[PDB]
Amino acid sequence: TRPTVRPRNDVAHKQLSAFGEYVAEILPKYVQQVQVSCFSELEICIHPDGVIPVLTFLRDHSNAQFKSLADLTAVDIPTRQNRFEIVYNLLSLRFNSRIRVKTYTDELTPVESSVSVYKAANWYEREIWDMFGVFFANHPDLRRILTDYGFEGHPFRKDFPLSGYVELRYDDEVKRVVAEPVELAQEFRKFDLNSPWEAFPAYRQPPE
Amino acid sequence: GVRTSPTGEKVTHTGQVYDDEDYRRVRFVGRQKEVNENFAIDLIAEQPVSQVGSRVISCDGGGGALGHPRVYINLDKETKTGTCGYCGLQFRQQH
Amino acid sequence: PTVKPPTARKFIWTNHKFNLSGTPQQYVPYSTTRKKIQEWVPPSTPYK
Amino acid sequence: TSVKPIFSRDMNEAKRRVRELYRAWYREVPNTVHLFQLDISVKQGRDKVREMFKKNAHVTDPRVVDLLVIKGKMELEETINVWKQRTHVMRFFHETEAPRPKDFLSKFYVGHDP
Amino acid sequence: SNLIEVFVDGQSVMVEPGTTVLQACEKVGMQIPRFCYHERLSVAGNCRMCLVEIEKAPKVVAACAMPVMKGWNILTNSEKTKKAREGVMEFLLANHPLDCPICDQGGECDLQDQSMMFGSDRSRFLEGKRAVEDKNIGPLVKTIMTRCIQCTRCIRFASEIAGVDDLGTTGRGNDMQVGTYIEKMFMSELSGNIIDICPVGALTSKPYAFTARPWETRKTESIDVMDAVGSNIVVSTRTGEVMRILPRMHEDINEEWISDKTRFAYDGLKRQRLTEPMVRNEKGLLTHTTWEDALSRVAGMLQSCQGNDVAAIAGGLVDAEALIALKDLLNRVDSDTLCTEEVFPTAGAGTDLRSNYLLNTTIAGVEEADVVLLVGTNPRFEAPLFNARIRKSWLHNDLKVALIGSPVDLTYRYDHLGDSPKILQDIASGSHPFSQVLQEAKKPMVVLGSSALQRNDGAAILAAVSNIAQKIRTSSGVTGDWKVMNILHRIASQVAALDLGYKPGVEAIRKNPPKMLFLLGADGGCVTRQDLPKDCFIVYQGHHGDVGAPIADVILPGAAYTEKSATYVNTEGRAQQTKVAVMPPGLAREDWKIIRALSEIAGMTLPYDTLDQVRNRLEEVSPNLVRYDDVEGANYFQQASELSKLVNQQLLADPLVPPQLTIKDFYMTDSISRASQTMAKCVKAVTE
Amino acid sequence: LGLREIRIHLCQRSPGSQGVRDFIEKRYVELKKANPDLPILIRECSDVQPKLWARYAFGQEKNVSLNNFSADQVTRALENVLSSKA
Amino acid sequence: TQLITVDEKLDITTLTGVPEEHIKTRKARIFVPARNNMQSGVNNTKKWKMEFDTRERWENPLMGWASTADPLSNLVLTFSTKEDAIAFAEKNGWSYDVEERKVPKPKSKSYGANFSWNKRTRVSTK
Ligand code: SF4
Ligand code: SF4
Ligand code: FES
Ligand SMILES: [K+]
Ligand SMILES: [Zn+2]
């Protein structure tokens, strides 16, 4: 298993599991799950109402010092009743490490903003509202940053189609760029690429 | 050997030709209809048949790695010539 | 190519053509497939 | 059934926010018409605002109407400051689309839309 | 309970004795790789893909054949299991030709998928592969035996399910070929199903060959309408064009098979279609005309009638929605002369009770029976999958089959009692040993074919069979849950029309001739212009123009069964719905939409606009039509038997000859099949 | 101008249809002998309340609820429906 | 407290931004997809698929490409079981048709049945 297989590190896995136990024991009010992946990456899953009292801990404790906010992401999983999965990625420079803090929300449930902790989120979660529809409480300046000004609907939801609902064209009748219902010259060919055999035995879910 | 429909249009090797009442022929006025004059079937038709000394024969299309994957053709029958799946070449046995 | 000529083939063009856009020999796209669904031609005989 | 509120505790506060949004839009319709050099009357824009407000007037959930009020505030902020264009304001008034058929006979003549 | 406990990967599970290792691993949730094992075929065990290791045992066992024992721990993903799978893949791909880019199985091939997910990634074979000469078995299966792996599903299907016993394995060793040893045309009613059970690309659908590819196709579930079985199918289309038809999985109807007519009617579905309304010109030649003019002409000629001067004939491919729409439209004009092509006797109970015109038990009830008595039918060509179910019960359940009619082949052995209908009169009076055979039976079954009811004395035969069934049901050992009187149908639109209250047969029109006739795809020619008055306004509403379209005055193009959402009821009373795969070509619309638009333009507008309102109307007239995939039992055979005993009808001594005898009369049945090139090729192949 | 067809929807198992079942169990037979040309369509289903649909001339329809009815009450119901003739 | 009580059905048609005609006139379909009969794997029949109907797909005037007008023609959603699919379908106001899954019956396979003595299950060839 030497040349074509990725090497496995166990000291980093043990240290990340120890830090996960440390975090889950320091904060038992909001932390739900702690899991270390196979490629040595820690994940903390907490309650949404504990987004803010956890993160500042990871920004201010001497044993964590996760001073950088790398990426902030929401993931749409329509199976769960809380279809939006907010993901904070934190980087600690003094200890040279990376952590992931995950939480959940639905459409109508507000989430407490993180601009009081990391100022970069002042843009990041704002883009989330532009793409998914997750409302963030006490945001300083919340407005759409990527989509069009008159755009209705959140495009990154999985129920939103690939092509939109309106397409633009110039009109000499009104001398204006107008929006019309979408009519494609060629349909987007949907491909069925999933092999019908069992993919991995180690990731086998139990049946009903 | 292109055939001419009596609407004036040349006919492609796929057999497509616009009918005399079709309006889409107005896309060809003031311009030309581009059609390949090298028909594939009429160019593979005159290629001679090779007699081999064994029951089965391997075809790769020539050039080694520059052709099609190598396929083995059985020539057990004495009525039809064994034609290659990819290249269209046909082999047979001298018996 | 004066010392290394290309291999001769029966389908290689004997004359090169420049860009023909804007001229009456320019390329226009068209479908290369026949009619997909045929139509019921009515009979020519009287119905009585 | 226990949910977290955002701004509106009950339906009365949400209706108060709706009335505030309509007040602001009725205030800012003439300035939107004058500043963008829109070639329509003030009454057309004001009754367009009324038509949209009556169109979205079927909701009984405080959170949904609260989010509608927030999105109306976003539209008001994008209109009050000149961030939109003439086409963005005129996109509400569909002027290029032909009137679609509505009765069954005309839709049967046109196509397969059920 | 005698369920013993076994282990899969250290996890306990309880199974019945006789459960294989493959079945236990499937019960836990891992699908063991296989090539020759099939869950509806006999176990062969001659590919060794299913080799797994039981712990504390120095040999790998075949999971497809070996039964489990108590305490067995099946190591499904240990080292030696993977070594055995990799060796089997190396041996399987040692002689396989490099034919994937010319193959029609590419993208849907079991060998490629199992080679990637279980086999190795490079070849140690440095020698020459074998090359097997190709054969031919008809114009339905393109035959390339170079790609066969000798899995022997061909022989097991042709011997067990199809029951023809012509395929075999000739040779010994590496030169063994799966063929027929002669120039024999393998042609049965379920031939094309072998194309479904070839894990490699050895056998290919010939009309489908070199036309499409699985990953670019869209799959739409639908219902088969070419017979009254009601098979569930999947139509795979490519960019708004139907490409191929595959069977679905339904353990009560069509388990994973379809007939060849279902498989190959699509190329005739895409030919000779009606794409525009046609009206008569000044001469009388049918010329094209927009929707408004034709609908106005029909409404103007319809408003001039009142009473029994309008009628309606429904073809074999009509949904219940258009049936109820035309029923409401002609009830506004107050005409009750609504007729179907196929004749059913209304004497006695008639179409009032549901118990005397359905396959009353189930399709699957043949598994719970032991004596079956067919009366004047040929179920091999009328309902081929019902015949396959009877054959399955004959093989496994040890059935006892008999037939009263012409000596026609049924792909098994039956008791030919003669073609005289008077033999039925022998069974009711006990003057035959078969009366005692039915008497000592536990769960008997009497099946009466629809083709025996289309003669001039169908009522007498129905009365005799009903008397026989009610004599067995009371005098013999029938508990009460079991139902004895069954009727097999052959038209998908017959049961749905009879459930809505239509008058079966065309005798009502022939009694009093109308001045306006409505045809819903009535290409059977039940009536012609010699059975009608001088000035008749015949209106045709169908997709294919075959027989009733040249004689029509106004032609209204409609939608086929793959082009509209349609509610169909099979021969057992189960209701099913089809789905739209491709929109109808040209200016053709859905049939009930045409009827509703005609009613709206005539001032007799019906109170439904969309499909859900029509289904609400269907629930209003008969609720069982809106309960999908749910069969409802129809009781009260006793009342029908009591009502059928009054009018004593005399029989006929003519032999009970079904109209379909050989395979050459099976392909040409309906309008879709009559305008097909594959069907004409099949007829030319079987008649030569 | 007349009665054209009668429809009786009922259930197979629910006790609310039970008396209606008794009608078909006891008094349907000669009823079919009473009217030789009136189609009385009996429709049995799984979980449907009893009903009686009577179609009159020119598409007129009448609905009479038959839930929790005895044999005599349902006999009076069909007798009134037959004696309407409107 | 910081919590309120809402006792109404979740209807978010007004916040998804979809047009009206693609809300009331579209019939969604929730189903377990059937196994492709050309293959033998059953991994593709593990999760529920929510799809929509098929609208018109006409030919292009240039080369006859599949020109369409439905924006929801390629929308396929995957749900773990039936109840969340029904909840999501009723959450966006889409009228739905639900088909129950069809589990195959566990057969009783015997290898010795091909070699019986007094039964019809004797195979003719092997
Ligand atoms: S049968 Fe399968 S492995 Fe063999 S050539 Fe065809 S696609 Fe390839
Ligand atoms: S042709 Fe296919 S199904 Fe028949 S024996 Fe060979 S691999 Fe099996
Ligand atoms: S599946 Fe068991 S040996 Fe083939
Ligand atoms: K195959
Ligand atoms: Zn070659």
The residue extents of the domains of chain F are 1-86
Which one-letter DSSP state was computed for residue E139? T
Work out the number of other CB atoms within 10 angstroms of the CB of residue E157.
26
Q: Which of G19, E462, G87, F32 is nearest to D97 (CA)?
A: G19
Structure-block tokens of residue F63: 């609905």
Which residues lie below 8 Å from residue C21, measured CB to CB, with a gap of 6+? Answer: none
Give dist(CA E260, CA A164) in Å, integer: 43
Q: b vs e for F40-57, b when ≥16 Cβ sit within 10 Å of the residue's Cβ?
A: bbbbbbeebebbbbbbbe
Which residue from F5, F57, F61, F35 is spatially nearest to E330, judged by alpha carbons? F57
Single-letter code of the amino acid located at E179: G
The three-point CA angle A149-A150-A153 to 5° equals 105
Token pair in block for residue B24: 């889409």
Chains with at least 3 CB pairs less than 8 angstroms from chain A: D, E, G
Residue with tokens 């924006």: G71
State how beta strands E537-542 and E554-557 pair.
parallel
- Please answer whether residues G77 and A78 qualify as being in contact, where contact means their C-beta atoms are separated by less than 8 angstroms: yes
**Which residues, including other chains, have CB under 8 Å from residue E373's CB and lie 6 or more apart?**
E402, E403, E404, E427, E434, E438, E444, E445, E446, E447
CA angle B10, B11, B14 (to 5 degrees): 155
Identity (one letter) of the amino acid at G26? Answer: R
State whether E273 and C40 contact (CB < 8 Å).
yes
What is the distance between the alpha carbons of residues A105 and A112, in angstroms, rounded to a whole number?
11
C-beta neighbour count of D110 within 10 angstroms: 10
Instruction: From chain E, pick out residues whose CB is under 8 angstroms from the CB of G57.
Output: 239-240, 582-583
Q: How near does any CA of chain C get to the CA of E585, in Å?
A: 8
Picking from F1, F9, F40, the nearest residue to E623 by CB comes out as F9
Ligand 3 pocket: which of E26, E31, E37 to mutate (most atoms within 8 A of CB): E37
Cβ–Cβ gap E98/B58 under 8 Å: no
Q: Which residues contact E536 (CB under 8 A, 6 or more apart)?
A: E514, E515, E516, E517, E529, E553
Task: State the DSSP H helix or E strand holding residue E435, giving kind and residue range, or none if neither.
Answer: helix E433-439
DSSP label at residue E607: S
Note the ligand closest to the C-alpha atom of E85: 3
User: With b meaning 16 or more CB within 10 Å and e meaning fewer, what string describes A125-164?
Assistant: bbbbbbbbbbbbeebeebebeebebbbbbbebbebbbebb
Asked whether E449 and E379 are in contact (CB, 8 A), the reply is yes
Domain span including residue G57? 20-99
Whether A137 sits inside 8 A of D78 (CB atoms) is: no
The pair of three-digit structure tokens given for residue E227, joined into one six-digit string: 């017979």
Let me know: does D49 contact D25? Beta carbons within 8 Å.
yes
- CB-based contact (8 Å) between A141 and chain G? no
Instruction: Tell me the backbone φ, ψ of residue B27, rounded to 5 degrees.
Output: -70, -15
Name every chain D residue with its beta carbon within 8 A of the beta carbon of G2. Answer: 4-5
Q: Is G32 on the interface with A (CB under 8 A)?
A: no
CA distance F55 to F8: 12
- The encoded tokens of residue A175 equal 């001398």
Q: Which among E173, E121, E106, E178 has a CA at the least distance from the CA of E146? A: E178
Flag whether residue C2 sits within 8 Å of chain G, measured between CB atoms: no
Which of E289, E229, E656 has its CA nearest to residue E461? E656
Cα torsion angle, G16, G21, G23, G26, sign = negative
Six-digit token pair at E574? Answer: 């189960």
Q: Give CA–CA dist E119/E48, Å, rounded.
A: 13
**Annotated binding site: which residue ranges of B?**
59, 68, 84, 87
CA distance E515 to chain C (A): 16
Give the CA count within 13 Å in the CB-facing half-sphere of E225: 31
3-class state of residue E68 by DSSP: coil
Of E545, E549, E585, the CB nearest to C37: E585
Cα distance between residue D18 and residue C44, in whole Å? 70
Residue of C36, C45, C47 to mutate when probing chain E, most E C-beta within 10 A: C47
Rounded to whole angstroms, the Cα distance separating F77 from A17 reads: 78
Strands E516-520 and E310-314: parallel
Which tokens is E570 given? 């099979």
Q: How many angstroms separate the first and last alpha carbons of chain E? A: 59
G88 in Cβ contact with G79 (< 8 Å): yes
Q: For residues E25 and E41, is the Cβ–Cβ distance under 8 A?
A: no
From the list E583, E609, E611, which residue is nearest D104 (CB)? E609
Pairwise CA distance, residues E537 & E229, whole Å: 35
Q: Please report, for chain D, the start and end positions of each structural domain, with discontinuous segments joined by +.
A: 1-114
3-state DSSP of chain A: CCCCCCCCCCHHHHHHHHHHHHHHHHCCCCEEEEEECCCCCEEEEECHHHHHHHHHHHHHCCCCCCCEEEEEEEEECCCCCCCEEEEEEEEECCCCEEEEEEEEECCCCCEECCCCCCCCHHHHHHHHHHHCCCCEECCCCCCCCCCCCCCCCCCCCCCCCCCCCEEEEEECCCCEEEEEECCECCCCCCCCCCCCCCCCCCCCCCCC
Residue of chain E nearest C40, judged by CA positions: E272
**What's the burial of A205, exposed, middle or buried (CB within 10 Å: 0-12/13-18/19+)?**
exposed
CA angle B47/B52/B56 to nearest 5° reads 110
Instruction: Retrieve residue C45's tokens.
Output: 């005989």
User: Residues E382-408, buried b or exposed e (16+ Cβ, 10 A)?
Assistant: bbbbbbbbbbbbbbeeebbbbbbbbeb
Contacts by E111-116, CB closer than 8 A, 24 or more apart? E111/E35, E111/E149, E111/E199, E111/E200, E113/A195, E113/A196, E113/A197, E113/G39, E113/G41, E114/A197, E114/E33, E114/E35, E114/E49, E114/E89, E115/E89, E116/A195
- Phi, psi (degrees; rounded to nearest 5) at C32: -110, 20
Give the integer Cα–Cα distance in Å for E372 and E429.
19
Is-contact D15 D56, C-beta < 8 A? no
Token pair for B49 = 């048949």
What value does the CA radius of gyration of chain F take, rounded to a whole number of Å?
A: 12
Interface of E with A in 570-609 (CB under 8 A): none
Tell me which amino acid residue E464 is.
A
DSSP strand pairing (E4-8 vs E51-54): unpaired
Does the C-beta of E614 come closer than 6 Å to ligand 2? no
Asked if A45 and A80 touch (Cβ cutoff 8 Å), the reply is: no
Residues of D in contact with E583 (CB under 8 A): 112
Method of determination? cryo-EM
CA atoms of C31 and E590, how far apart (whole Å): 30
D2, G5 contact by CB (below 8 A): yes
CA of residue E576 relative to chain centroid, distance: 13
What is the interface size between A and D, counted as CB pairs within 8 Å? 46
Find the residues whose C-beta lies inside 6 A of ligand 1.
Answer: E 96, 99-100, 103, 105-106, 109, 111-112, 147, 200-201
The CATH number for G45's domain is 3.30.160.190
For residue E638, the tally of other CB atoms under 10 A from its CB is 14
Q: What are the φ/ψ torsions at residue E41 (nearest 5 degrees)?
A: -135, 160
Of E198, E200, E201, residue with least CA distance to E209: E201
DSSP state of G103: P
Q: Judging by beta carbons within 10 Å of its beta carbon (0-12, 13-18, 19+), is residue D90 exposed, middle or buried?
A: buried
Amino acid symbol at F17: S
Q: State how far Cα C27 lies from the chain centre.
A: 10
* Ligand that comes closest to the CA of residue E102: 1
Crossing angle (nearest 10°) for helices E492-500 and E320-332: 40
**What residues form DSSP beta bridges with E516?**
E310, E537
Distances in Å between the Cα of E668 and the Cα atoms of E547, E662, E676 are: 14, 12, 9
Option in F24, F43, F57 nearest E334 (CB) = F57
CA distance B25 to E431: 79
Q: Is A106 in contact with A130 (CB distance < 8 Å)?
A: no
Chains touching F (at least 3 CB pairs under 8 A) are E
* Identity of the amino acid at E649: Q
Residues 6 or more apart whose CB falls under 8 angstroms from that of E283 comprise C46
Return d(Cα E649, Cα A102) in angstroms, integer.
82
* Nearest to E463, CA basis, from E500, E408, E421, E417: E421
Q: At what angle do helices D11-35 and D62-80 cross, to 10 degrees?
A: 20
Bridge pairing between strands E177-179 and E168-170: antiparallel
CA atoms within 13 A on the CB side of D5: 14
Q: Which residues of E324-355 are buried (b: 16+ CB within 10 A; e: fewer)?
A: bbbbbbbbbbbbbbbbbbbbbbbebbbbbbbb
